[PDB]
Design a protein around this ligand. Structure first.
Ligand SMILES: O=C(O)[C@@H]1C[C@]2(C(=O)O)C=C[C@@H](O)[C@@H](C2)O1
Ligand SMILES: O=C(O)[C@@H]1C[C@]2(C(=O)O)C=C[C@@H](O)[C@@H](C2)O1
Ligand SMILES: N[C@@H](Cc1c[nH]c2ccccc12)C(=O)O
Ligand SMILES: N[C@@H](Cc1c[nH]c2ccccc12)C(=O)O
Lengths: 252, 252
């Protein structure tokens, strides 16, 4: 799977292989975040103890958005597989453009669930993966930066749906063209769901969590929780992006 | 703790013991609700697909209010520990009155947070305890009825604050009389907060959630979430009722 070989990019298998390598990345990232308390204050927008000059949002917010700006400048978002958590704040690259062939539809950047991911991450995931409950009054930076690692991997993974979505469309235009004109969610949802795969995925996760989540010489990550996270969130939103991308596919 | 032994009712310990038995009730209720999707449509007031003849409100609304009426008739609300979610719609009992001695101040019925509880329950709790996200197009009744079980236990528990509040007042009139005339929230808040207890509570919850939330032969309820719910909502609003009841205590 290379971005300058549209064929390898739109291959459904190659895509799944890539999602797989990501499983480990996410696990690792979770494991790292697991070393710190939940740190409520990091996520509170405009916390009194952490007022950020000219900024409405959370500590995490500041850190993340800033990083997105810096990165935007060095071509981060002109890569189709990277969708910004703060699209309203990203500048243009001061580096000559990498001219990636179009592999997706022109509106792809507009398909963007980060808003959700971030909320669910903070509300549902954190409680599952952190040591204690409470503020680690002098690790907010440590926590935030890690949070961002998680968030950027989740977003990459999830937004990969677009590639899958496109891949599936391509492979039976009529079936999908029919479904899309109809705005037949349930029908589309039915066709993209492939439970067999979803299941085998949760199986790997459980093993990985077992072997990675424990010092081989315990439980920095709970296998059940890792499954829960994926099963309830990761995989549901990935599909949720496929339908979305699909509805607008015939668009224009 | 018997309602016809004012002394056992106003005992701070007996009261805490009763709040404890409730922990399990709530857990059980959560666990039951956990079997179904979030079912957005149940909570939407006047949903097009579920228009209820002569009724402005949600499906849940209809079901709950109706039940409150029926119950009111058979003496439900003349019991001090039961505070109505729909006080504006409850009738009088067609059964001879149980004549409970006054154990609380006369305005107690007026101290009523259901409005909040219901909103927070729907917005914050549901997302934490349900299987999937989405409408289970043919379980709205199943979901609603369960929702009501949760709501009625939460409300009972939370409004128990009044009893605690009264209990504490009684045990140092001057301190509180002083505080109340002053409208000294923070002072009152400080005196009723007893972190030690709050903490031991969250400890039990975590264990219970572990043992109850899993088939002993998993995770119908997440221990962390159960704590979150209590820590963030249950316990905060219970206090919020104690101050409220307290401010109006000297009233008249
Ligand atoms: O075809 C696929 O492989 C993709 C990925 C997906 C996931 O989230 O892992 C797995 C199974 C499918 O039901 C969906 C979602 O599309
Ligand atoms: O004295 C008490 O026992 C009550 C109950 C309470 C709770 O919500 O559990 C626990 C501790 C106190 O800080 C408050 C709230 O008053
Ligand atoms: N992988 C692409 C885009 C990219 C991904 N992550 C980044 C972070 C910073 C800058 C660019 C990127 C590239 O570097 O060409
Ligand atoms: N426990 C009281 C009041 C009560 C509680 N829940 C009820 C439901 C319906 C009718 C009455 C009640 C009684 O039954 O005497």
């Amino acid at each position: 799977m290379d971005f300058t070989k549209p064929e390898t990019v739109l291959n459904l298998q190659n895509i799944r292989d890539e999602l797989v390598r990501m499983e480990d990345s996410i696990i690792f990232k979770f494991i790292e975040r697991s070393h710190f308390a939940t740190c409520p204050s990091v996520y509170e927008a405009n916390h009194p103890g952490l007022e950020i000059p000219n900024f409405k949002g959370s500590f995490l917010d500041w850190a993340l958005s800033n990083l997105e700006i810096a990165h935007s400048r060095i071509r981060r978002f002109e890569s189709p597989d990277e969708t910004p958590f703060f699209p309203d704040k990203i500048q243009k690259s001061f580096l000559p453009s990498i001219n990636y062939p179009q592999i997706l539809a022109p509106y792809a950047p507009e398909v963007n669930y980060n808003d959700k991911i971030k909320k669910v991450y903070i509300e549902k995931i954190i409680p599952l993966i952190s040591k204690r409950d409470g503020d680690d009054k002098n690790n907010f930076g440590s926590v935030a930066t890690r949070d961002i690692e998680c968030l950027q991997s989740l977003s990459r993974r999830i937004h990969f749906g677009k590639f899958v979505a496109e891949a599936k469309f391509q492979s039976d235009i009529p079936l999908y063209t029919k479904l899309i004109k109809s705005k037949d969610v349930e029908g589309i949802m039915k066709n993209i769901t492939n439970s067999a795969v979803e299941e085998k995925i949760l199986e790997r996760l459980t093993k990985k969590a077992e072997v990675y989540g424990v010092d081989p010489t315990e439980r920095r990550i709970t296998p059940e929780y890792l499954v829960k996270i994926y099963k309830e969130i990761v995989i549901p939103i990935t599909k949720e992006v496929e339908v979305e991308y699909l509805l607008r596919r015939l668009e224009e």
